A paper describes a structure:
Insect [name] from the Asian corn borer ([name]) is a β-N-acetyl-D-hexosaminidase specialized for chitin degradation during molting and metamorphosis. [name] shows high activity toward β-1,4-linked chitooligosaccharides but is not able to hydrolyse β-1,2-linked GlcNAc from N-glycans, thus exhibiting very high substrate specificity.
Since we have obtained the structure of [name] V327G mutant previously, in this study, the crystallization of [name] in complex with [name]-chitotriomycin was performed and the complex structure was resolved to 2.5 Å. According to the alignment, the mutation of Glu328 to Ala resulted in obvious conformation changes. The rotation of Glu368 led to the collapse of the two important hydrogen bond networks (Asp249-His303-Glu368 and Glu328-H2O (I)-Glu368). The conformation of [name]-chitotriomycin, in particular the GlcNAcII moiety, was found to be very different from that observed in the wild-type. The interaction between the nitrogen atom of the 2-acetamido group (GlcNAcII) and the oxygen atom of the carbonyl group (main chain of Trp490) is missing, but instead, C6-OH of GlcNAcII forms a hydrogen bond with the main chain of Val327.
Author numbering: 23 to 594
The structure:
Amino acid sequence: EDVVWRWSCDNGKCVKLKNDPRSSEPALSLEACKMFCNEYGLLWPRPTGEADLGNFLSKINLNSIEVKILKKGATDDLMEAAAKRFKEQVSLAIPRGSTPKLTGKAVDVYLVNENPNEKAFSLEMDESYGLRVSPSGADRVNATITANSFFGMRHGLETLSQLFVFDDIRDHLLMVRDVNISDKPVYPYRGILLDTARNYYSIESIKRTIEAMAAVKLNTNHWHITDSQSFPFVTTKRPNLYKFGALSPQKVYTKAAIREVVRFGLERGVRVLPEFDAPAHVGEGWQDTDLTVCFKAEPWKSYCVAPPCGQLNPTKDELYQYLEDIYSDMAEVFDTTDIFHMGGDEVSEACWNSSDSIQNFMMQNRWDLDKESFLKLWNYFQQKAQDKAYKAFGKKLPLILWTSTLTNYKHIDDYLNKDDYIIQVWTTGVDPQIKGLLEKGYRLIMSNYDALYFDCGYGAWVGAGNNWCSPYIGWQKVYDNSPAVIALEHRDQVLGGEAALWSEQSDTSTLDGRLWPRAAALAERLWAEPATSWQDAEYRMLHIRERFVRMGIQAESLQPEWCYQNEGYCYS
Ligand SMILES: CC(=O)N[C@@H]1[C@@H](O)[C@H](O[C@@H]2O[C@H](CO)[C@@H](O[C@@H]3O[C@H](CO)[C@@H](O[C@@H]4O[C@H](CO)[C@@H](O)[C@H](O)[C@H]4[N+](C)(C)C)[C@H](O)[C@H]3NC(C)=O)[C@H](O)[C@H]2NC(C)=O)[C@@H](CO)O[C@H]1O
């Protein structure tokens, strides 16, 4: 049949009413009402600058959308790719199975890239843009996007595509008539950590993830590509690592596959940031190299915090030749990244202390078998690993490490320095380590586990009950979690945040639901740092969820669709 209802805006809420035949008032479709009833309409994330949507919509012909690139340059193929993708994205306003009438105005999109040669990812990159929409002559629409760089330009394309609504009452494709928007992200680093080691993720699912990221302007895919459970990274120089380390020969990331993902990311403003986690979290792949200790050590509880146990042996020099080669193979294929993540998850002192080679080596350096000495061994490892990373990437570049006993702000400056090392924070936001680190000059990526661990909440994967960081974290908690509140006056030292999906209990099948649409909550927090809380973003969050589903993403359902159709009636 055809849609029976209509919606009217009353005190910021779209309320459902019978579409009565005896009325001289034009009925509004659901999302047409939402576009002007909501403070920010259907936009996600909301702009940080001018956000003026005017009062009207204009009927648009889907086949009359043309894109013109005004300043040609070295980003030509990227801009042409993003332009070609524009039509497909506008089509996302239209629900599947619904066909818009081909009538209405023509749409001219004018892309102005002020520095058309700039293709590099950096923390200082300019992601700002400006968007104006306006009637041009009679039969057409002028959409002008102006940005300092390609990245701002394609963010602008994303926002513009969000200014289309499908009227399912009339079968009309509509677009906001008069728009003035200026926008720039609050934080340079907006990411998702994907663990592809604890379980395998098809590369299509990784690309699909990147798509969903670009839709909400997340700019960083942190690819945690190895751990103790597997080595899917294809290293041409050390091929036995992946041959013995992969879950199967099918479950692997080839050079061609990684290049595809990296390029796919670049086109969508997503930096693909590789991690090689060391000296802990190593395991499969290293068999018979004699370069590890404690692999599969039983009882595991006595050695590491989760099975299988395994750690690199810093005392073997051949190790750094392995490391150099791995980093080199990574540097070749992940060639858009300006940053390298070197892990540094808690090293087990028990693990290192159960080896003869290691104790002998520490005897000779006069170091003892106490704590500070194993901290010295770790530092020795990190200094050498770091040198090899610098060589592999052909330059010094920023390195990321997790908070750990090594990164304790009290002694951190013995080991690292704040110019070369960025610290990813997985503690709580109320943890004293954060203020210590900030006071000592260090930069942070907030992945605090009480608000940002997307794996929390499910059944236990060892024993019974629930998993370690339960309860499950709803989008509300991830929205209200503010790095500005956490870092206070030192907030410029916060580079941004990252949603972490650890994969002990997640893979190809579960990934859409794990990330979406909670990552969108993080996306807006990082993009706009709103002083407003989640309830103010609720309605738009429900819409963005629907947009994800339309994109083919299997996003988690937040609320009954009834709530979405009847704003204000679901509350607590
Ligand atoms: C086994 C047992 O009976 N333990 C009880 C507990 O009541 C309690 O100790 C708990 O033991 C668990 C297993 O040793 C600990 O779980 C582990 O926690 C770490 C984080 O500290 C997890 O690793 C991190 O998190 C992600 C996954 O979210 C993981 O993928 C990353 O590699 C890692 N890093 C982010 C740090 C890089 C780890 O996966 C998890 N392991 C599990 C669940 O097997 C748990 O932390 C610990 N709980 C507490 C509250 O300390 C202990 C309390 O006295 O008593 C033990 O008898």
